[PDB]
Amino acid sequence: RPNIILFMVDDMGWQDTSLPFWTQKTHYNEVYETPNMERLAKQGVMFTQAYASSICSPTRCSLITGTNAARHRVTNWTYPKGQQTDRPSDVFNVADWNVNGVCQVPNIDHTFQATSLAEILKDNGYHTIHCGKAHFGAVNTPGESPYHMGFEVNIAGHAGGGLASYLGENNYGNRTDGKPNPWFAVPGLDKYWGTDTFVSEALTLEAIKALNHAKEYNQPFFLYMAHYAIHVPIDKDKRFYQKYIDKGLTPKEAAYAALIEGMDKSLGDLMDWLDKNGEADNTIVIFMSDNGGLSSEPGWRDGKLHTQNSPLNSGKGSAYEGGVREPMIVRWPGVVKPDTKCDKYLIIEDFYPSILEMAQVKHYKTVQPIDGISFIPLLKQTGDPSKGRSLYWNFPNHWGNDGPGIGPTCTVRKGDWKLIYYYENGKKELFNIPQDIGEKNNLAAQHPDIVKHLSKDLGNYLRKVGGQRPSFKATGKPCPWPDEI
């Protein structure tokens, strides 16, 4: 039974790497430096059409419970207990969504009760390690604890979905007065306060400590290496920052490239550990990101706004490909043909049944229905779970910044066609993704047959799984479903 490592970067877009996931190298592929992603890819398969939701919380709750985001209703980011983080709107009320996230127990207000992926792995004999960003439940809610969620070891994981600082010189946001700590102060790295250890480095050091400890136990391990990295604020990692200045990047872009290269140093350190300790041929490594790169905030990024995941449109918080299409690599020695690419689409809730299959766990009990479809047939080249398959997103919410494809929406992807419905004004956009990867050309008027059919598909699904919608403040009435206009 293999060890499993799920290496999850935060807010990393499809092109925030030197490894080309498109059909040619982009301007971004040329300036970033991720040699360890390339090396991992030479040894495995990369998925060029892998999907998440557009925001941390819906993606990570889908990962750990195996439900679609429309069903678990954690559709915008969580932290404050019993409170909606949504930006105000003069037009609509957001859905009455599950602001407190997921947990494994019943009767926790505004949560989705679910059998945790880590719990099933643990109860089947895996040693389970969480390291970095957890972000599964609101603060003072059982899901705030990686331990409650079935992890036996927890490094730095709590309810926070961001981080107050990468810099050890700032204690990662922790106060040494009687000052109250920020929400996103990173716990569990006290050993490193006041030093110049970047938080990404510290997480990898502690992760390697946990991995050496796991080698004392005669059981396989599951490691969730969930970086805070490349979430805002984009602090400068001085280990690589100047090199990108010398390369001619703006300070903003140099800072961002340097978070990327530091993330990739963490992957290499783990890969080197696997090599030095004889675990590499018996260990599955999965690389993933949880939503698109941030392309709506010019105070962090340069370039034309909403183009920082080029050639994809927009980014984090958007229904467009820039916000949902993610870099994904799997290495499974003996099973997965090295140096290959797979173009069949999949979505984050598939990780749940797939990882359990990799762990050799069958007919397990869950309190919630599982919406993920295993993508082992893509890993083994034996089947195509994307054929005839519909993928669903639902964001009856209001995130923080305006832009293309951002706002309260629900999306269905089926075959070549993507339907994006806009709850606020009833607008519909139809894109043929293989022909129009940048979502430049709205085909809705040229194909009302596809629009009607896809709208029914989307509408039936949302209602079937209990998905929610916003309502209009002027009238009190719910926004029509896609198939009601």
Binding site for Ca ion (CB under 5 A): 10-11, 56, 290-291
Instruction: Rule CB under 8 A: say whether 181 interacts with its own copies.
Output: no
- Residue 446 binds: one of its own copies, Ca ion, none (C-beta under 5 to 8 A by kind): none
- For residues 369-383, one letter each, b for 16 or more C-beta atoms within 10 angstroms of the residue's C-beta and e for the rest, the string is ebbbbbbbebbeeee
How far from 31 is each of 25, 28, 163, 260, CA to CA, in Å? 10, 6, 26, 11
Identified binder of its own copies from the candidate list 58, 142, 385, 396, rule CB under 8 A: 142
Q: State how far Cα 342 lies from the chain centre.
A: 19
Q: Which stretch binds its own copies (CB under 8 A): 37-45, 137-145, 281-289, 392-400?
A: 137-145
- Classify burial at 112, counting beta carbons within 10 Å of its beta carbon; exposed 0-12, middle 13-18, buried 19 or more: buried
- Residue 213 binds: one of Ca ion, its own copies, none (C-beta under 5 to 8 A by kind): its own copies
Q: Check the CA dihedral 343-345-350-353 and report its sign.
A: negative
Helix (H) or strand (E) holding 316: none
Instruction: Rule CB under 8 A: say whether 178 interacts with its own copies.
Output: no
Smallest gap from Cβ 190 to its own copies, in A, equals 7
Identified binder of its own copies from the candidate list 1, 25, 27, 105, rule CB under 8 A: 105
8 Å CB contact between 284 and 40: no
Residues present in the chain in total: 485
- Residue 339 binds: one of Ca ion, its own copies, none (C-beta under 5 to 8 A by kind): none
How far from 372 is each of 5, 75, 284, 296, 381, CA to CA, in Å? 19, 17, 19, 30, 18
Instruction: Rule CB under 8 A: say whether 282 interacts with its own copies.
Output: no
Binding to its own copies (CB under 8 A) within 185-204 occurs at: 190
**Between 213 and 380, whose beta carbon lies closer to its own copies?**
213
Instruction: Rule CB under 8 A: say whether 140 interacts with its own copies.
Output: yes
CA distance 271 to 249: 29
CA distance 254 to 260: 10
Q: Which stretch binds its own copies (CB under 8 A): 60-68, 99-107, 284-292, 304-312?
A: 99-107
CA distance 225 to 439: 32
Instruction: Rule CB under 8 A: say whether 206 interacts with its own copies.
Output: no
CA distance 147 to 119: 9
CA distance 25 to 438: 15
Instruction: Rule CB under 8 A: say whether 106 interacts with its own copies.
Output: yes
- Does 10 carry a binding-site annotation? yes
Instruction: Rule CB under 8 A: say whether 219 interacts with its own copies.
Output: yes
Instruction: Rule CB under 8 A: say whether 207 interacts with its own copies.
Output: no
- Does 290 carry a binding-site annotation? yes
**Between 33 and 119, whose beta carbon lies closer to its own copies?**
119
Instruction: Rule CB under 8 A: say whether 141 interacts with its own copies.
Output: yes
Please tell me the count of residues contacting its own copies according to CB under 8 A. Answer: 22
Q: Which stretch binds its own copies (CB under 8 A): 41-49, 138-146, 158-166, 355-363?
A: 138-146
Helix (H) or strand (E) holding 130: strand 127-132
Where is the binding site for Ca(2+), in residues?
10-11, 290
Residues that bind its own copies (CB under 8 A): 81, 105-109, 125, 127, 140-142, 145, 147-148, 152-153, 190, 213, 216-219
